[PDB]
Amino acid sequence: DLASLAIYSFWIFLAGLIYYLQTENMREGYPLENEDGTPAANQGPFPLPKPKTFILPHGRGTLTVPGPESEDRPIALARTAVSEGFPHAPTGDPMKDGVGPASWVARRDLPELDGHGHNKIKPMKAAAGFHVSAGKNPIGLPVRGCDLEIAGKVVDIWVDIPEQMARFLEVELKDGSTRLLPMQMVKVQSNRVHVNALSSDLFAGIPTIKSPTEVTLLEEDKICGYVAGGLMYAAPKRKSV
């Protein structure tokens, strides 16, 4: 029967496809590791795929995956149990050490470039022809932390040029230096910008950027990590509201 042949073949195909898909999804993070970072004994029934290479634009190299996995940064955490499967306690301040929900990855310390090789994200002040087109303009709004105290003031929006969208608010602190806040972690209100994740005392500790008119992928990760970390780690200072 031709339907029987069709349905039986399709199941063979779907099994092969699921196998292939799972292996493709093991191009990052594998081989699996023990808690000490050595290779685990049981890797599973799926093997690592054969490596592929992405040719990155703008002379930025390739990426070949799978390859040798490494954190490329120290992890300030320690075991809390004598066997596998329990949490690992921060050994210092998890927000400064960048662990837990404050974690960051050691992405390239260069900015993301657009199709034409230009920095993807720029302060709006430096982005020819960019302006706020609808919504409350946050520039000039005081910025409030979850301790209900003012941490600073908004001095610019950092915009994604090719996608025409707000990505960070640039916030000036008491000492006149600035920090970037992810736009996804702020609430623009009629008379302020509210930041639930951080109390005002934590703003100074936001990782700074080394050049004031561009951010690197590495710097984005440190800022975004640190801000998200505050939901857990600034909870004591987080007033009800």
């Binding site: 029967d1 029987s4 898909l21 999804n25 191009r27 992405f54 022809g129 609430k187």
Partner: protein, 302 residues
């Protein structure tokens, strides 16, 4: 509330983005259209430009002729009365030739011929539009995944309208052009083939259709959940894994014990979707050509 990132809080606008050039013939791109502040709360505000070369003009024109062929038939069914046209719009139907005409073109216009003309125009609109999905990719140096994916949808459509009717010996087996009439056709097709719930390919197709909803809910929710770390910038997360891609994987690993990568979730995605109409097309193609009754088939084949 935390901001949830479903709508944007502030819109920014800059100079109209005219796009990458690569090998595209710029003579064929319109100027930019207007900007919609309304679309802008949710996606991009910018409309246009559009590329329209000769294959695009063919597809559009042919598409419009399909649409006018049905339209003119409806207006005729309505006795040229716009009151009646609006009233009975969902009830009108352009029906294929009777069984007696087989696969011939001999049928009167009012009783098959217009359906054949309409189907002709649709055939040209879709296939040229397919070519346009390949060529627009080619001109930008991108892969052809879209044109391959589109071919799976074309398959189900080709099966319902052309391949299955040809294999059965008559245009009368194809689907009428009409809102209600095509639903009636669908119901009737199942009744007459012993209940399509007994077709294993139909069950598969449902699994994938539902699964597409599961998967895009999972994936959209996920990217939005990690948008605070730049997660929607998927190409760069592919090229240089960030804490967005890592938190996204680990959410799923901790929930269900396995996970994806940023590139690879898009392979789960293309396949989950494409298998809807691939399996669906097989199921329909086999119906009445090889299997007259799926309940019966079922009883003899597990």
């Amino acid at each position: 509330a935390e901001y949830q990132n479903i709508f944007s809080q502030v819109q920014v606008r800059g100079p109209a983005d005219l796009g990458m050039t690569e090998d595209v013939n710029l003579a064929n791109r319109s100027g930019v259209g207007p900007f919609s502040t309304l679309l802008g709360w949710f996606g991009n505000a910018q409309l246009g430009p559009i590329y329209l070369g000769s294959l695009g003009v063919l597809s559009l024109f042919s598409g419009l002729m399909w649409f006018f062929t049905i339209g003119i038939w409806f207006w005729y069914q309505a006795g040229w009365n716009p009151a009646v046209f609006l009233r009975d719009l969902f009830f009108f139907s352009l029906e294929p030739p009777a069984p007696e005409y087989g696969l011939s073109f001999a049928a009167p216009l009012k009783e098959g011929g217009l359906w054949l003309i309409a189907s002709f125009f649709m055939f040209v609109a879709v296939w040229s539009w397919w070519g346009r999905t390949y060529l627009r990719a080619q001109a930008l140096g991108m892969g052809k995944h879209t044109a391959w994916a589109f071919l799976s949808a074309i398959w189900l459509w080709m099966v319902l309208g052309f391949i299955r009717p040809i294999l059965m010996g008559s245009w009368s087996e194809a689907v009428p052009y009409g809102i209600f009439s095509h639903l009636d056709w669908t119901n009737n097709f199942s009744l007459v083939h012993g209940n399509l719930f007994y077709n294993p390919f139909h069950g598969l197709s449902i699994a994938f259709l539902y699964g597409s909803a599961l998967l895009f809910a999972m994936h959209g929710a996920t990217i939005l959940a990690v948008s605070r770390f730049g997660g929607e910038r998927e190409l760069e997360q592919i090229a240089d894994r960030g804490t967005a891609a890592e938190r996204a994987a680990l959410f799923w690993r901790w929930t269900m014990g396995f996970n994806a990568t940023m590139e690879g979730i898009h392979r789960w995605a293309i396949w989950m979707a494409v298998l809807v109409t691939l399996t669906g097309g097989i199921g329909i193609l086999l119906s009445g050509t090889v299997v007259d009754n799926w309940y019966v088939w079922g009883q003899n084949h597990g």
